Amino acid sequence: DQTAEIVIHKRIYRDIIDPNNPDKDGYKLLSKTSGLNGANFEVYDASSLLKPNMTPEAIRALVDRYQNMTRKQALKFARANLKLAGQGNKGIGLMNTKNDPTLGEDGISRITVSVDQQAPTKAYLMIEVAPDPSNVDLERKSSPMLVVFPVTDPISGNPLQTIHLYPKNVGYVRDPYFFKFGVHPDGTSKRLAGAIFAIYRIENGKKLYLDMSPVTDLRNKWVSTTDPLHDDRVNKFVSDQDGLVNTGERFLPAGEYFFEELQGVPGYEAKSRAIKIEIPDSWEDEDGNRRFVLIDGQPMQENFGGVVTPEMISSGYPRVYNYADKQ
Template identity: 40%
Template sequence: MKRLKGILLTLLLLLPMISVFGLATQADAQGDTVDLVLHKRIIRDINKDEVTYENNGLELDEDFDIVTGPTPLNGAEFTVYDISDYFYAEKADQSLEALMKEYGNRTAAKELIKSGKIQEIATVSTGAEDNPRGTARVPVSRKKDGRYALYLIFENEVVNDTVEFNIDLERIANPIIVALPIMNPTNQTEELDEIHIYPKNIGYLRDPYFFKYGKENAESPEIGVPLEGAIFVLYQMVGNQKLYLDLSPVSDLQNSWIPSDDPLNNPDVSKFTSDKDGVVTTGGRLLPSGEFFFEEVQSVEGYQIEKTDIPVVVPDSWEDENGNPLYVTVNGQQMDELESGEVPASAYQKAEPRVYNYETLTDPATPQQPDEPTPPKKPFLPVTGEAKSFISLIGVLLLGIGLVIWHRRKAAIKSNSEDK
């Protein structure tokens, strides 16, 4: 999946348009109805590149790989409308290609539906009743008043509340026009009685990343160094409970979340480790819109975890209503979009979004030896045997000086007496 990461997948419905006139003789041999089989599959929206394929009305193999392989989605609601009368009365001078272009966007199709000029045939949901996962079947008449029928397929909404990815219906669930007959591509003289239709479905998800750096402390002016080997888990809050991203396959768009009291040592919780550049990614595990948290569960030697929980905010679309880009933020910092599924060069140049750990007071990798005790400074008159001797010597000298002075004074007094 690594090589596939980063490619946005788009399904373009390209039904072959055959003239609706002049085929009555061959059609008489066919049945009165045709089954429209709708396949709702979500493709991981990693970037804006488009990959197209030709849908010819036949069913694709279950394991077909449109780069990453799609995920069937239950609960997508479609309404099928008969637009035959409207077409023959007001649009017969147009080509079918022009008709599809005119009503291939949701705004125009909604206006046509509101006009009351077309007839609702059925509303169905994928995965309902006996339909296989992600599919819905609608039987329709092959002809209307002796002429081949035309149908509009309009996706209303996704009604399954358990899905954990977003679908931008206004931008990606384009209406589909089916003009009968659809011929078998392997035998152009045979009409298809079962027409498989794959609407253009893109799952809106994002792939957050950030840079893990270390430096001495928060006041240090330098940018720091990338930290390799820091371990993170990802969680979201559901009510008051932390639920961690589990080890579901990367290709599964519907992420699973589990509780855990020890996510670091829980083998069912996904772990994300910073690489040599300090980059932490989800490794292809894409996220829908909402708020999530990277939780650092193990730092690298010599650095302490400064911030355990790192908030990740995924907006609900690529752009706002004015066409301005909406960015993912990590730790409150804007994240440059991935390029072809990879962290862009601009992000490496800035090392942003960036989250720091600071150095510990001691490095566990090289424990310091206890300092040698510093000998206490000797006081001016240390109380030792040497000090006592020193004091005795001073006393003797003082005594000698005193005797000398005394003798001199005595001699001076005697001399004065004799002079008198």
């Protein structure tokens, strides 16, 4: 008889459950192309979880019950008792997230399921399973999703023919910045404009530089370069009129990195100074205390979302001091 399409949009969000909503309170998407490929779902015919003439409240209670199970608990139930169903891209009831060339979007997986648009008699239980082997740090927080048809479109009054689901994956990133100051031999000092930095990390005893490639998943791309200053692949960060050297839209995950000065400010130019970035792997320690990014060992104030505020700019910290008086 009749079918509907369930479309999973698997994306990655940064922290600071309605699976049908692409907006998530307490979270924000990592980029416009932050879809997550390689995620896998099993989809079960869950019509036997329904009863005839059940109320909307009973359906919501059932949906909530399954959403509040862990994936492993829901799999224990579904694997034992239900059958795979729906035409997925990996098989009956089997979905893998891939790029959608039509929509131009990553993290997409579509499944066609038999539905009853006139009464709630068909339902599908969707549960994420292990991703394709290959982002170990990603928090895959999707829940068991019980999709009960029909889902009526309030605008149109029609049953929805496509259900869009936005299962939540959370990527941990932080946002380094610092201020470059210049110190005159007479003790005067100022914010420095025009310092050109790049970011590198160490891998196998060699430098890899943060490149200009679009972010995919939570991952930045890193390049070996012969000439980071003039290599267009290497992202440069320029100190502005407030002295601010800001990763800006760029973010970094946990680990150790370096801001490398590629062009010093005239008069404040000895191998190229490397300012250490130490990014802890969580916002908070065991006791809920903030864990700071360290810039050359200095704690760096930071807000969720990573935007450097006017108040942070006024503060001008952390600051790295460049001496005009060469000694």
